[PDB]
């Protein structure tokens, strides 16, 4: 894959409910957010967009245990899971909530209410 985050994110959903203005794009019905070799699985994802700026919305999804699975390109398989997941292109902070367990190659961030300082 070389660079996952360097590639355009794909939100695979069964229900695409796009607001007429674009204020909110609702993704429901088992959503598979894939990025390179990363495969996130949620049930309800709410992407809000004021309208105009593209490439930086807000990957906010919850419902089914949002797992962070990745194919072992380095031989080491990535594994993670939480109740709520969050990813952003600018805010490079994985904010998970509810049984939040995530490790990159060896470790990352784990707990439940992932909060910083």
């Amino acid at each position: 894959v070389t660079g996952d985050t360097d590639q355009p994110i794909h939100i695979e959903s069964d229900q695409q409910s796009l607001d007429m203005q674009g204020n909110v794009v609702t993704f429901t019905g088992n959503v598979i957010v894939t990025q390179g070799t990363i495969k996130i699985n949620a049930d309800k994802v709410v992407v809000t967009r004021p309208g105009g700026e593209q490439g930086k919305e807000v990957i906010d999804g919850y419902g089914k245990p949002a797992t962070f699975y990745q194919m072992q390109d380095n031989g080491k398989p990535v594994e993670g899971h939480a109740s709520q997941m969050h990813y952003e292109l600018a805010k490079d902070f994985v904010v998970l909530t509810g049984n939040a367990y995530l490790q990159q190659v060896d470790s990352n961030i784990k707990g439940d209410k992932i909060t910083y300082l």
Binding site: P8, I11, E12, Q16, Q54, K56, A90
Partner: peptide, 21 residues
């Protein structure tokens, strides 16, 4: 901080279409 985003694309499994935001 430097901002380097990517064209996020919404894909729909029902119709099989991908609409870039």
């Amino acid at each position: 901080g430097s901002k380097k985003p990517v064209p996020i694309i919404y894909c729909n499994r029902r119709t099989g279409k991908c609409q870039r935001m």
